[PDB]
Amino acid sequence: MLSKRDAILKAAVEVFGKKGYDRATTDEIAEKAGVAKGLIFHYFKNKEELYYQAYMSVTEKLQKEFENFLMKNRNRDIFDFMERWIEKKLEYSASHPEEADFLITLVSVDEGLRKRILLDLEKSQRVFFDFVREKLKDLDLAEDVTEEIALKFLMWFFSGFEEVYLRTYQGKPELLKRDMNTLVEEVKVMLRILKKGMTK
Amino acid sequence: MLSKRDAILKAAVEVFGKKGYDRATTDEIAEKAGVAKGLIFHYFKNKEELYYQAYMSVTEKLQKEFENFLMKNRNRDIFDFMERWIEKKLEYSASHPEEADFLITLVSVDEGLRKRILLDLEKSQRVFFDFVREKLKDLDLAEDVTEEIALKFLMWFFSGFEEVYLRTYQGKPELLKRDMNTLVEEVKVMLRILKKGMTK
């Protein structure tokens, strides 16, 4: 069976993703996890720490999948790189819907909690950011488009698309699987649009 | 002085925008508005109705500003149209920060409340949507870009940019005013990027 801490973290992902941070209570996470309530306090102190730890836990496993992807695909054109990784993220969300539902809740938590998580994730997200930045120096940019506007626009596209499908398909993995081909084709054309508009 | 219902609505915009929907209580809105609590019940029934009415109230005044803008700018190129309207939205957010802070809270409310508001706003948002759709028939699109992918991408850009700056500048109007010129220049280049990538 799961360790206690892992049982609580799984229950937390499920409850938080189902109800959002403010509505969820630790008592129902403990009940979901079938664990003594004071065990949540033992391991996590309070609800805010539980959420943050659950959040770091899910992102940590994704960061690792990203790190291998980056190693193997490091030489690709950056738009092909992005498209391929978006496909993998879409694949993962469909097979891990509870985790995907949980991740999108980061917009509900107070200012302070979301900023803490963003401060503590900055170092890991900057790994993808710094790779895009270096890859853009190889790009034959339009005479009116700076590497800065390119980086800004590409990251917004990337992060914004993820936000859109996670929110749109929230709690509906079968719908995501059903639209997967179409989303993928749409993402291909949009990245080609951006490449063509940004380059000579 | 304000009518009672208007006093409650103003207090609601301020409290909801400061604390988010779940955290806010009607008692503190009434206290903020300096009105009897049962007056909130008289006019609004419960917290969910108050939020929805406040939301319809702020969007109604924006929809009207949009309708005049559309009338006067109807003949413009759609990318110039979008850029000009984005400038006006940025101007408005900076001079109505409490309203801007309130509008971005729509991501925290339960699924049911946000969908109700989205169902009831569909008819008014579709006014801008249907104009873009007709304007795209005049566009000399790339041989690989459908009017459907164009419409999808332009609306996402438009709605996504608004979401980004509202969230980024939340509670910081002086920062928005300070970055306004740069944001505007960035938006110009990004729309030119999209136009160039979408067209022949």
Coordinates of N, CA, C and O in Angstrom, one line a residue, chain A residues 48-194:
Chain A
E48 N -2.2 25.1 3.6 CA -1.4 25.8 2.6 C -0.1 25.0 2.3 O 0.3 24.8 1.1
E49 N 0.6 24.5 3.3 CA 1.7 23.6 3.1 C 1.3 22.3 2.3 O 2.1 21.9 1.5
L50 N 0.2 21.7 2.7 CA -0.2 20.5 1.9 C -0.3 20.8 0.4 O 0.2 20.1 -0.4
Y51 N -1.1 21.8 0.0 CA -1.2 22.3 -1.4 C 0.2 22.5 -2.0 O 0.5 21.9 -3.1
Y52 N 1.0 23.3 -1.4 CA 2.3 23.6 -1.9 C 3.2 22.3 -2.2 O 3.7 22.1 -3.2
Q53 N 3.2 21.4 -1.2 CA 3.9 20.1 -1.3 C 3.3 19.2 -2.4 O 4.0 18.6 -3.2
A54 N 2.0 19.1 -2.5 CA 1.3 18.4 -3.6 C 1.7 19.0 -4.9 O 2.0 18.3 -5.9
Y55 N 1.7 20.3 -5.0 CA 2.1 21.0 -6.2 C 3.5 20.8 -6.6 O 3.9 20.6 -7.7
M56 N 4.4 20.8 -5.6 CA 5.9 20.6 -5.9 C 6.0 19.2 -6.3 O 6.9 18.9 -7.1
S57 N 5.2 18.3 -5.8 CA 5.4 16.9 -6.0 C 5.0 16.5 -7.5 O 5.7 15.8 -8.2
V58 N 3.9 17.0 -7.9 CA 3.4 16.8 -9.3 C 4.4 17.4 -10.3 O 4.8 16.8 -11.3
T59 N 4.8 18.7 -10.1 CA 5.7 19.4 -11.0 C 7.1 18.8 -11.1 O 7.7 18.7 -12.1
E60 N 7.6 18.3 -9.9 CA 8.8 17.6 -9.9 C 8.9 16.4 -10.9 O 9.8 16.3 -11.6
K61 N 7.8 15.6 -10.9 CA 7.8 14.5 -11.8 C 7.7 14.9 -13.3 O 8.3 14.3 -14.2
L62 N 7.0 16.0 -13.5 CA 7.0 16.6 -14.9 C 8.3 17.2 -15.3 O 8.7 17.2 -16.5
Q63 N 9.0 17.9 -14.4 CA 10.2 18.5 -14.7 C 11.2 17.4 -15.2 O 11.9 17.6 -16.1
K64 N 11.2 16.3 -14.5 CA 12.0 15.2 -14.9 C 11.8 14.6 -16.3 O 12.7 14.3 -17.0
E65 N 10.5 14.4 -16.6 CA 10.1 14.1 -18.0 C 10.5 15.1 -19.0 O 11.1 14.8 -20.0
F66 N 10.4 16.4 -18.6 CA 10.9 17.5 -19.4 C 12.4 17.4 -19.6 O 12.9 17.5 -20.7
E67 N 13.2 17.1 -18.5 CA 14.6 17.1 -18.6 C 15.1 16.0 -19.6 O 16.0 16.3 -20.4
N68 N 14.5 14.8 -19.6 CA 14.9 13.8 -20.6 C 14.5 14.2 -22.0 O 15.2 14.0 -22.9
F69 N 13.3 14.8 -22.1 CA 12.8 15.2 -23.4 C 13.8 16.2 -24.0 O 14.2 16.1 -25.2
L70 N 14.2 17.2 -23.2 CA 15.1 18.2 -23.7 C 16.5 17.6 -24.1 O 17.0 17.9 -25.2
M71 N 17.0 16.7 -23.3 CA 18.3 16.0 -23.7 C 18.3 15.3 -25.1 O 19.2 15.5 -25.9
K72 N 17.2 14.6 -25.4 CA 17.0 13.9 -26.6 C 16.6 14.7 -27.8 O 16.8 14.3 -29.0
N73 N 16.1 15.9 -27.6 CA 15.4 16.7 -28.6 C 16.1 18.0 -28.7 O 15.7 18.9 -29.5
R74 N 17.2 18.2 -27.9 CA 18.0 19.4 -27.9 C 18.4 20.0 -29.2 O 18.3 21.2 -29.4
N75 N 18.7 19.2 -30.2 CA 19.1 19.7 -31.6 C 18.0 20.1 -32.5 O 18.2 20.6 -33.6
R76 N 16.7 19.9 -32.2 CA 15.6 20.1 -33.1 C 15.4 21.6 -33.2 O 15.9 22.4 -32.4
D77 N 14.8 22.0 -34.4 CA 14.2 23.3 -34.5 C 13.3 23.6 -33.3 O 12.6 22.7 -32.9
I78 N 13.4 24.8 -32.8 CA 12.6 25.2 -31.6 C 11.1 25.1 -31.8 O 10.4 24.7 -30.9
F79 N 10.6 25.4 -33.0 CA 9.1 25.2 -33.2 C 8.7 23.7 -33.3 O 7.7 23.4 -32.7
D80 N 9.5 22.9 -33.9 CA 9.3 21.4 -33.8 C 9.5 20.9 -32.4 O 8.7 20.1 -31.9
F81 N 10.5 21.4 -31.7 CA 10.7 21.1 -30.3 C 9.4 21.4 -29.5 O 8.8 20.5 -28.7
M82 N 8.9 22.6 -29.5 CA 7.7 23.0 -28.8 C 6.5 22.2 -29.2 O 5.8 21.7 -28.3
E83 N 6.2 22.0 -30.5 CA 5.1 21.2 -31.0 C 5.2 19.7 -30.4 O 4.2 19.1 -29.9
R84 N 6.4 19.1 -30.4 CA 6.5 17.8 -29.9 C 6.3 17.7 -28.4 O 5.8 16.7 -27.9
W85 N 6.7 18.7 -27.7 CA 6.6 18.7 -26.2 C 5.1 18.9 -25.9 O 4.5 18.3 -25.0
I86 N 4.5 19.8 -26.6 CA 3.0 20.1 -26.5 C 2.2 18.8 -26.6 O 1.3 18.4 -25.8
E87 N 2.5 18.0 -27.7 CA 1.9 16.7 -27.9 C 2.1 15.8 -26.7 O 1.2 15.0 -26.4
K88 N 3.3 15.8 -26.0 CA 3.6 15.0 -24.9 C 2.8 15.5 -23.7 O 2.3 14.7 -22.9
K89 N 2.6 16.8 -23.5 CA 1.9 17.3 -22.4 C 0.4 17.0 -22.6 O -0.3 16.6 -21.6
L90 N -0.1 17.1 -23.8 CA -1.5 16.7 -24.1 C -1.7 15.2 -23.8 O -2.7 14.8 -23.3
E91 N -0.8 14.4 -24.3 CA -0.8 12.9 -23.9 C -0.8 12.6 -22.4 O -1.7 11.9 -21.9
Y92 N 0.0 13.3 -21.7 CA 0.1 13.2 -20.2 C -1.2 13.6 -19.4 O -1.7 13.0 -18.5
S93 N -1.7 14.8 -19.8 CA -2.9 15.3 -19.3 C -4.1 14.3 -19.4 O -4.9 14.1 -18.5
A94 N -4.2 13.7 -20.6 CA -5.3 12.7 -20.9 C -5.1 11.4 -20.1 O -6.2 10.8 -19.8
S95 N -3.9 11.1 -19.7 CA -3.7 9.8 -18.9 C -3.5 10.1 -17.5 O -3.4 9.1 -16.7
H96 N -3.4 11.3 -17.1 CA -3.3 11.8 -15.7 C -4.3 12.9 -15.4 O -3.8 14.0 -15.1
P97 N -5.6 12.7 -15.7 CA -6.6 13.8 -15.6 C -6.7 14.4 -14.2 O -6.9 15.6 -14.1
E98 N -6.4 13.6 -13.1 CA -6.5 14.2 -11.8 C -5.4 15.1 -11.5 O -5.6 16.2 -10.9
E99 N -4.2 14.8 -12.0 CA -3.1 15.7 -11.9 C -3.3 17.0 -12.7 O -3.0 18.0 -12.3
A100 N -3.7 16.8 -13.9 CA -4.1 17.9 -14.8 C -5.1 18.8 -14.2 O -4.9 20.0 -14.1
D101 N -6.2 18.3 -13.6 CA -7.2 19.0 -12.9 C -6.6 19.8 -11.7 O -7.0 20.9 -11.4
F102 N -5.7 19.1 -11.0 CA -5.1 19.7 -9.9 C -4.2 20.9 -10.3 O -4.2 22.0 -9.7
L103 N -3.4 20.7 -11.3 CA -2.4 21.8 -11.7 C -3.1 23.1 -12.1 O -2.6 24.2 -11.7
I104 N -4.3 23.0 -12.7 CA -5.0 24.3 -13.1 C -5.6 25.0 -12.0 O -5.9 26.2 -12.1
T105 N -5.7 24.4 -10.8 CA -6.2 25.1 -9.7 C -5.3 26.2 -9.2 O -5.7 27.0 -8.4
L106 N -4.1 26.3 -9.6 CA -3.1 27.3 -9.1 C -3.7 28.8 -9.2 O -3.4 29.6 -8.3
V107 N -4.5 29.0 -10.2 CA -5.5 30.2 -10.2 C -6.8 30.0 -9.3 O -7.9 29.8 -9.8
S108 N -6.6 30.1 -8.0 CA -7.8 30.3 -7.1 C -7.1 30.6 -5.8 O -7.7 31.3 -4.9
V109 N -5.9 30.1 -5.6 CA -5.2 30.2 -4.3 C -4.9 31.6 -4.0 O -4.9 32.4 -5.0
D110 N -4.7 32.0 -2.8 CA -4.5 33.5 -2.5 C -3.2 34.0 -3.3 O -2.4 33.2 -3.8
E111 N -3.0 35.3 -3.3 CA -1.9 35.9 -4.0 C -0.6 35.3 -3.5 O 0.2 34.8 -4.3
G112 N -0.5 35.3 -2.2 CA 0.7 34.8 -1.5 C 1.1 33.4 -1.7 O 2.3 33.1 -1.9
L113 N 0.2 32.4 -1.7 CA 0.4 31.0 -2.0 C 0.9 30.8 -3.5 O 1.8 30.1 -3.8
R114 N 0.2 31.5 -4.5 CA 0.5 31.3 -5.9 C 1.9 31.9 -6.2 O 2.6 31.4 -7.0
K115 N 2.2 33.0 -5.5 CA 3.6 33.6 -5.7 C 4.7 32.8 -5.1 O 5.7 32.6 -5.8
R116 N 4.5 32.3 -3.9 CA 5.4 31.3 -3.3 C 5.7 30.2 -4.2 O 6.9 29.8 -4.4
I117 N 4.7 29.6 -4.8 CA 4.8 28.4 -5.7 C 5.5 28.9 -7.0 O 6.5 28.2 -7.4
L118 N 5.1 30.0 -7.5 CA 5.8 30.6 -8.7 C 7.3 31.0 -8.4 O 8.2 30.7 -9.2
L119 N 7.6 31.6 -7.2 CA 9.0 31.9 -6.8 C 9.8 30.6 -6.7 O 11.0 30.6 -7.1
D120 N 9.2 29.5 -6.2 CA 9.9 28.2 -5.9 C 10.0 27.4 -7.2 O 10.8 26.5 -7.3
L121 N 9.1 27.7 -8.2 CA 9.2 27.0 -9.5 C 10.0 27.8 -10.6 O 10.2 27.2 -11.7
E122 N 10.4 29.0 -10.2 CA 11.1 29.9 -11.2 C 12.3 29.2 -11.7 O 12.5 29.1 -12.9
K123 N 13.1 28.6 -10.8 CA 14.4 28.0 -11.2 C 14.2 26.8 -12.1 O 15.0 26.7 -13.1
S124 N 13.2 26.0 -11.9 CA 12.9 24.9 -12.8 C 12.3 25.3 -14.2 O 12.7 24.8 -15.2
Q125 N 11.3 26.2 -14.2 CA 10.7 26.7 -15.5 C 11.8 27.4 -16.3 O 11.7 27.4 -17.6
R126 N 12.7 28.1 -15.7 CA 13.7 28.9 -16.4 C 14.6 27.9 -17.3 O 15.3 28.4 -18.2
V127 N 14.6 26.6 -17.0 CA 15.3 25.7 -17.8 C 14.8 25.6 -19.2 O 15.6 25.7 -20.2
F128 N 13.5 25.5 -19.4 CA 12.9 25.6 -20.8 C 13.1 27.0 -21.3 O 13.5 27.2 -22.5
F129 N 12.8 28.1 -20.6 CA 13.0 29.5 -21.0 C 14.4 29.7 -21.5 O 14.5 30.3 -22.6
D130 N 15.4 29.3 -20.8 CA 16.8 29.6 -21.2 C 17.2 28.9 -22.5 O 18.1 29.3 -23.3
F131 N 16.6 27.7 -22.7 CA 16.8 26.9 -23.9 C 16.2 27.7 -25.1 O 16.9 27.9 -26.1
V132 N 15.0 28.1 -25.0 CA 14.3 28.9 -26.1 C 15.1 30.1 -26.4 O 15.3 30.4 -27.6
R133 N 15.6 30.8 -25.4 CA 16.4 32.0 -25.6 C 17.6 31.8 -26.5 O 17.9 32.5 -27.4
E134 N 18.3 30.7 -26.1 CA 19.5 30.3 -26.9 C 19.1 29.9 -28.3 O 19.8 30.2 -29.3
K135 N 18.0 29.1 -28.4 CA 17.6 28.6 -29.7 C 17.2 29.8 -30.7 O 17.4 29.7 -31.9
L136 N 16.7 30.9 -30.1 CA 16.3 32.0 -30.9 C 17.4 32.8 -31.6 O 17.1 33.4 -32.6
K137 N 18.6 32.7 -31.1 CA 19.8 33.3 -31.8 C 20.1 32.6 -33.1 O 20.9 33.1 -33.9
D138 N 19.5 31.4 -33.3 CA 19.8 30.6 -34.6 C 18.7 30.9 -35.6 O 18.8 30.4 -36.7
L139 N 17.7 31.7 -35.2 CA 16.6 32.0 -36.0 C 16.9 33.2 -36.8 O 17.5 34.2 -36.3
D140 N 16.4 33.2 -38.0 CA 16.6 34.3 -38.9 C 15.4 35.2 -38.8 O 14.5 35.1 -39.6
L141 N 15.4 36.1 -37.8 CA 14.2 36.9 -37.4 C 13.9 37.9 -38.4 O 14.8 38.4 -39.1
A142 N 12.7 38.3 -38.5 CA 12.2 39.5 -39.3 C 13.0 40.6 -38.8 O 13.4 40.7 -37.7
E143 N 13.3 41.6 -39.7 CA 14.0 42.8 -39.4 C 13.3 43.7 -38.3 O 13.9 44.5 -37.6
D144 N 12.0 43.5 -38.1 CA 11.3 44.2 -37.0 C 11.0 43.5 -35.7 O 10.3 43.9 -34.9
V145 N 11.5 42.2 -35.6 CA 11.1 41.4 -34.4 C 12.3 41.1 -33.6 O 13.2 40.4 -34.1
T146 N 12.3 41.6 -32.4 CA 13.5 41.4 -31.5 C 13.4 39.9 -30.9 O 12.4 39.3 -31.0
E147 N 14.6 39.4 -30.4 CA 14.6 38.1 -29.8 C 13.7 38.1 -28.5 O 13.2 37.1 -28.1
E148 N 13.7 39.3 -27.9 CA 12.8 39.5 -26.8 C 11.3 39.4 -27.1 O 10.6 38.7 -26.3
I149 N 10.9 40.0 -28.2 CA 9.4 39.9 -28.5 C 9.1 38.4 -28.9 O 8.2 37.8 -28.5
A150 N 10.1 37.8 -29.6 CA 10.0 36.4 -30.0 C 9.8 35.5 -28.8 O 9.0 34.6 -28.7
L151 N 10.7 35.6 -27.8 CA 10.7 34.8 -26.7 C 9.4 35.0 -25.9 O 8.7 34.1 -25.6
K152 N 9.1 36.3 -25.7 CA 7.8 36.6 -25.0 C 6.6 36.0 -25.6 O 5.7 35.4 -24.9
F153 N 6.5 36.0 -26.9 CA 5.3 35.6 -27.7 C 5.3 34.0 -27.7 O 4.2 33.5 -27.4
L154 N 6.4 33.4 -28.0 CA 6.5 31.9 -27.9 C 6.2 31.3 -26.5 O 5.5 30.3 -26.5
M155 N 6.7 31.9 -25.4 CA 6.4 31.4 -24.0 C 4.9 31.6 -23.7 O 4.3 30.8 -23.0
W156 N 4.4 32.8 -24.0 CA 2.9 33.0 -23.9 C 2.1 32.1 -24.6 O 1.0 31.6 -24.1
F157 N 2.5 31.7 -25.8 CA 1.7 30.7 -26.6 C 1.8 29.4 -25.9 O 0.8 28.7 -25.8
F158 N 3.0 29.0 -25.6 CA 3.2 27.7 -25.0 C 2.4 27.6 -23.7 O 1.5 26.8 -23.6
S159 N 2.6 28.5 -22.7 CA 1.9 28.5 -21.4 C 0.4 28.8 -21.5 O -0.4 28.3 -20.8
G160 N 0.1 29.6 -22.5 CA -1.3 30.0 -22.7 C -2.1 28.8 -23.2 O -3.2 28.6 -22.9
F161 N -1.5 28.0 -24.1 CA -2.2 26.9 -24.8 C -2.5 25.9 -23.7 O -3.6 25.4 -23.6
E162 N -1.5 25.7 -22.8 CA -1.7 24.7 -21.7 C -2.8 25.1 -20.8 O -3.6 24.4 -20.4
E163 N -2.8 26.4 -20.5 CA -3.8 26.9 -19.6 C -5.2 26.7 -20.3 O -6.2 26.3 -19.6
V164 N -5.3 27.0 -21.6 CA -6.6 26.8 -22.2 C -7.0 25.4 -22.3 O -8.2 25.1 -21.9
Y165 N -6.2 24.4 -22.7 CA -6.8 23.1 -22.8 C -7.1 22.5 -21.4 O -8.1 21.8 -21.2
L166 N -6.2 22.8 -20.4 CA -6.5 22.2 -19.1 C -7.8 22.7 -18.5 O -8.6 21.9 -17.9
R167 N -8.1 24.0 -18.7 CA -9.3 24.6 -18.3 C -10.5 24.1 -19.1 O -11.5 23.7 -18.5
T168 N -10.4 24.1 -20.4 CA -11.4 23.6 -21.3 C -11.8 22.1 -21.1 O -13.0 21.7 -21.1
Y169 N -10.8 21.3 -20.8 CA -11.1 19.8 -20.7 C -11.1 19.3 -19.3 O -11.1 18.1 -19.0
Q170 N -11.2 20.3 -18.4 CA -11.1 20.0 -16.9 C -12.2 18.9 -16.6 O -13.4 19.1 -16.9
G171 N -11.8 17.8 -16.0 CA -12.8 16.8 -15.6 C -13.4 16.0 -16.8 O -14.3 15.2 -16.6
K172 N -12.9 16.2 -18.0 CA -13.4 15.6 -19.2 C -12.3 14.9 -20.1 O -12.1 15.3 -21.2
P173 N -11.6 13.9 -19.5 CA -10.5 13.3 -20.3 C -10.9 12.7 -21.6 O -10.2 12.7 -22.5
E174 N -12.1 12.1 -21.6 CA -12.6 11.4 -22.9 C -12.8 12.5 -24.0 O -12.5 12.1 -25.1
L175 N -13.2 13.7 -23.6 CA -13.3 14.8 -24.6 C -11.9 15.2 -25.1 O -11.8 15.4 -26.3
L176 N -11.0 15.3 -24.2 CA -9.6 15.6 -24.6 C -9.1 14.5 -25.6 O -8.5 14.8 -26.7
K177 N -9.2 13.2 -25.2 CA -8.8 12.1 -26.1 C -9.5 12.3 -27.5 O -8.9 12.0 -28.5
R178 N -10.8 12.6 -27.5 CA -11.5 12.7 -28.7 C -11.1 13.9 -29.6 O -11.1 13.8 -30.8
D179 N -10.7 15.0 -29.0 CA -10.2 16.2 -29.8 C -8.7 16.1 -30.0 O -8.2 17.0 -30.6
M180 N -8.0 15.1 -29.4 CA -6.6 15.2 -29.5 C -5.9 15.5 -30.8 O -5.1 16.4 -30.9
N181 N -6.3 14.7 -31.8 CA -5.9 14.9 -33.3 C -6.1 16.3 -33.8 O -5.2 16.8 -34.5
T182 N -7.3 16.8 -33.6 CA -7.6 18.2 -34.0 C -6.7 19.2 -33.3 O -6.2 20.1 -33.9
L183 N -6.6 19.1 -32.0 CA -5.8 20.1 -31.2 C -4.4 20.0 -31.7 O -3.7 21.1 -31.9
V184 N -3.9 18.8 -32.0 CA -2.5 18.7 -32.5 C -2.3 19.3 -33.8 O -1.3 20.0 -34.0
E185 N -3.2 19.1 -34.8 CA -3.2 19.8 -36.1 C -3.3 21.3 -35.9 O -2.5 21.9 -36.6
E186 N -4.2 21.8 -35.1 CA -4.3 23.2 -34.8 C -3.0 23.8 -34.2 O -2.5 24.8 -34.7
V187 N -2.3 23.1 -33.3 CA -1.1 23.6 -32.7 C 0.0 23.7 -33.8 O 0.8 24.7 -33.9
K188 N 0.1 22.6 -34.7 CA 1.1 22.7 -35.8 C 0.9 23.9 -36.7 O 1.9 24.6 -37.0
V189 N -0.3 24.3 -37.1 CA -0.5 25.4 -37.9 C -0.2 26.7 -37.2 O 0.4 27.7 -37.8
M190 N -0.6 26.8 -35.9 CA -0.4 28.0 -35.2 C 1.1 28.3 -35.0 O 1.6 29.4 -35.1
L191 N 1.9 27.3 -34.7 CA 3.4 27.4 -34.6 C 4.0 27.8 -35.9 O 5.0 28.6 -36.0
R192 N 3.5 27.3 -37.0 CA 3.9 27.7 -38.4 C 3.6 29.1 -38.7 O 4.4 29.9 -39.2
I193 N 2.4 29.5 -38.2 CA 2.0 30.9 -38.3 C 3.0 31.9 -37.6 O 3.4 32.9 -38.2
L194 N 3.3 31.5 -36.4 CA 4.3 32.3 -35.6 C 5.7 32.3 -36.2 O 6.3 33.3 -36.3

